Amino acid sequence: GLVIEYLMGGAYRCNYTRKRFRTLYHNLNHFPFPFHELMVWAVLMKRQKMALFFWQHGEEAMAKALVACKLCKAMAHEASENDMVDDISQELNHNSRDFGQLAVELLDQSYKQDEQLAMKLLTYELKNWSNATCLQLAVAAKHRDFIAHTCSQMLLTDMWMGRLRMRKNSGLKVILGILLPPSILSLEFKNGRKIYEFYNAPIVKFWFYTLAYIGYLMLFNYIVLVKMERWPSTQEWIVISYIFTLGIEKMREILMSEPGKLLQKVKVWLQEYWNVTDLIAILLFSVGMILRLQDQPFRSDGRVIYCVNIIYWYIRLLDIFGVNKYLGPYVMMIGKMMIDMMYFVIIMLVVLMSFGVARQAILFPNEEPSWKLAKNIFYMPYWMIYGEVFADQIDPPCQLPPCKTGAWIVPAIMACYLLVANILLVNLLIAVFNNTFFEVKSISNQVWKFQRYQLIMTFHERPVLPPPLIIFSHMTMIFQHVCRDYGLKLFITDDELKKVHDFEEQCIEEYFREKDDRFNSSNDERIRVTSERVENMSMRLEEVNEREHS
């Protein structure tokens, strides 16, 4: 039980380590689900045929497949970390892939048979598997091909829409409800309290946060564009309050993380790059504000830090855009193409420096050592490949001052430099982007459809008020400090549980039967069976012909 809790994750709790089983085992019965135990035994002992045999017998087949995939992945990682023979790691990874494919195929069959029962199969609480739905197990196993399935996407859409029924033209109606409160009681709701049901939907929280962020960006632009006085104005105080409350919210999110150790929670929070960049930006804004409330030079330095910091908050609109179906994969494709582009940037930088050093050395042979020498190399050779290729700034005409010795090579060097930079490297980069686009596009689609779950969960967990006035919700949590019906799970009775179990057994039997029928009717199997039967028939007929009494 301890090793299963170690392999699965932080929150998992096996049945062996429960107090009831510990008390039963201290003074030493049977198991209600024997194949649940035997499947885990066969998985932990690295017996794939036995595990595949035990998987198809019993209830909760999809949960067993997902748990087996996670266990095999964890065992492979542990074996690789302990410098094994490296064949054990490959075998365990193949076992994990096989179990993942089994889970995906079972989900496909279940969704193809019935839709509502399939969506009920992915959300009911699993008593025997540490109270975690199939979605949580599939996410913990990083199974991208499971969350990207159509049924999982429909389930995520239903969880995202909250308790509202509108599906044709949404978004605008949510904005109308947020901006005009006397329009909430005009929408259809799934089966006084209507306001609470409206404002707790993830989509309404998302649009509230979006509008607050747009207003904050507007105020930031206003305070940086116009002249700043000795003390902050009202808009500047609103911007400062937004930054401060966002920092408080980040601290609260860190404090309420999954692990139990303070330093362990920080490490798991500093995994997404957005969190690290947000921390850096908030710290830089605090430094700029500290410098801003001082005399004139420090005030100018703080204003310049504001002007630098506005760029990051403008860039962070792509995180808001990532909710859109078409603007998410494009942003991720951009992220991958930057890594593809860095190398050609390096090569072009080499060529640019090569031209610039020679031009500056030839045209200016009487220069004392000053740091402007390091600026003339990069400045104009970089600007000239973007449409500033002006002559007489390069290649000066030299009534006229005397021409420098050898100052005719410069037009010849900037005839090869432009040809290399604008005809060769950029066209090769275009070809590289062109021939590596299909794989990047497919990967981006899969990863975005996977991360939809994290988006929906983090907007289900978040408070209802946007960051500029979220301080009220934090004070409410203080009062509740001294004091999931849906969105994660879906609790059902025993009759519904039995119906779900029967549906799953029917689906898995149909899946195996259809797979066997497909295998038996393939051309290769028909050819093989026909060849064997023809060989046996030829032997028998030769025996008959040899055995004659006349």
Added chain:
Amino acid sequence: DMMYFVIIMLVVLMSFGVARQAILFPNEEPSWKLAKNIFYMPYWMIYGEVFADQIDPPCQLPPCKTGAWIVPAIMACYLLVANILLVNLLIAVFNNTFFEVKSISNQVWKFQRYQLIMTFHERPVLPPPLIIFSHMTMIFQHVCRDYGLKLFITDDELKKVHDFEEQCIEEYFREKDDRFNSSNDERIRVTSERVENMSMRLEEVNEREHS
């Protein structure tokens, strides 16, 4: 597709423009020209109007603004993102989604040829500048399709057309059945079944002997 990419381009452009205008001009009263300097020159810069000393001005010499060296450093990154990354990704997007768009456009144009022909069959004979004469003619005919849509035929021609259609549909079904029967999959399936039955029969014959 281009309008989907223009939003990201506009985000980058606005970030650079706001940063530059805020760095260079810190003593500006609130006027609507502040909302114009953000879009104007950052937009013209990516179409070949990169003009140093109009951006990054040299500063007998007026004093340099605090942090004015940041502006060309932001310009380098802005130009690299706008003119090397997003435009090349847009080229790749246009390149990899061209075959389907081309085929769909061909089919849709060949479909809409019918609507073009019908709307020019229905229209009056005079062009719009002097179409008022034809409208006045319709007024006189208000108080008063041999071809182009249909083609009326007699009973013998109708029977001939019916017989031709019956012959065509019979030939279509016969050809489809002949194609199906001679496929490799059907031949393999029939051969396997006949081999199985023949093996059963020969085993029965061998098991049934009298000498």
